[PDB]
């Protein structure tokens, strides 16, 4: 399937503010708002992100606008970047959008700072990966979240999204 049809199994879609598995304010389909507690500094950054006063709650078209805006910053961050590109260059399509899925969960630096992860993907070494993978906060703070990203390196295939 699609990166898009991909990252909304993962993230769902939520037309109104809630907590995300970390306690994290989030909106549409996986916008982080903020890590501040407060209901009203997520408020706050949803209207600086939308550009209106949205009290909480956004349109499905809204929702759509920040993850297209979401997707696009994690494809050209992996494309212009020296360590991400070999790798997802060297990657097989279905892997490629484990790859940005990845990278929109996590954001550029985290996942170029996974130096081993890369280098054993670009290698096949995929078993490895996956339990490398499996020792992040990235997955143990949020497992459900990551989980199938993990096995779709493993296997390559759409099968855990099926």
Same mark, same amino acid.
């Given at each position: 399937?699609?990166?898009? /049809?991909?990252?909304?199994? @993962?993230?769902?879609?939520?037309? !109104?503010?809630? &907590?995300?598995? /970390?306690?994290?304010?989030?909106?549409?389909? $996986?916008?982080?708002?903020?890590?501040? +507690? @407060?209901?009203?500094?997520?408020?706050? /950054?949803?209207? &600086?992100?939308?550009?209106?006063?949205? %009290?909480?709650?956004?349109?499905? @078209?809204?929702?759509?606008?920040?993850?297209? *805006?979401?997707?696009?910053?994690?494809?050209?961050?992996?494309?212009? %970047?020296? !360590?991400?590109? +070999?790798?997802?260059?060297?990657?097989?399509?279905?892997?490629?959008?484990?790859?940005? %899925?990845?990278?929109?969960?996590?954001?550029?630096?985290?996942?170029?700072?996974?130096? %081993?992860?890369?280098?054993?993907?670009?290698? !096949?070494? #995929?078993?490895?990966?996956?339990?490398?993978?499996?020792?992040?906060? #990235?997955?143990? *703070?949020? +497992? @459900?979240?990551?989980?199938?990203?993990?096995?779709?390196?493993?296997? $390559?295939?759409?099968?855990?999204? &099926?």
């Amino acid at each position: 399937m699609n990166i898009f /049809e991909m990252l909304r199994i @993962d993230e769902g879609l939520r037309l !109104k503010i809630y &907590k995300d598995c /970390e306690g994290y304010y989030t909106i549409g389909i $996986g916008h982080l708002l903020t890590k501040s +507690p @407060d209901l009203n500094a997520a408020k706050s /950054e949803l209207d &600086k992100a939308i550009g209106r006063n949205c %009290n909480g709650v956004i349109t499905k @078209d809204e929702a759509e606008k920040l993850f297209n *805006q979401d997707v696009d910053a994690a494809v050209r961050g992996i494309l212009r %970047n020296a !360590k991400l590109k +070999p790798v997802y260059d060297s990657l097989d399509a279905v892997r490629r959008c484990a790859a940005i %899925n990845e990278v929109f969960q996590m954001g550029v630096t985290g996942v170029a700072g996974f130096t %081993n992860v890369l280098r054993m993907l670009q290698q !096949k070494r #995929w078993d490895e990966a996956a339990v490398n993978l499996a020792k992040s906060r #990235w997955y143990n *703070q949020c +497992p @459900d979240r990551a989980k199938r990203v993990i096995t779709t390196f493993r296997t $390559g295939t759409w099968d855990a999204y &099926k």
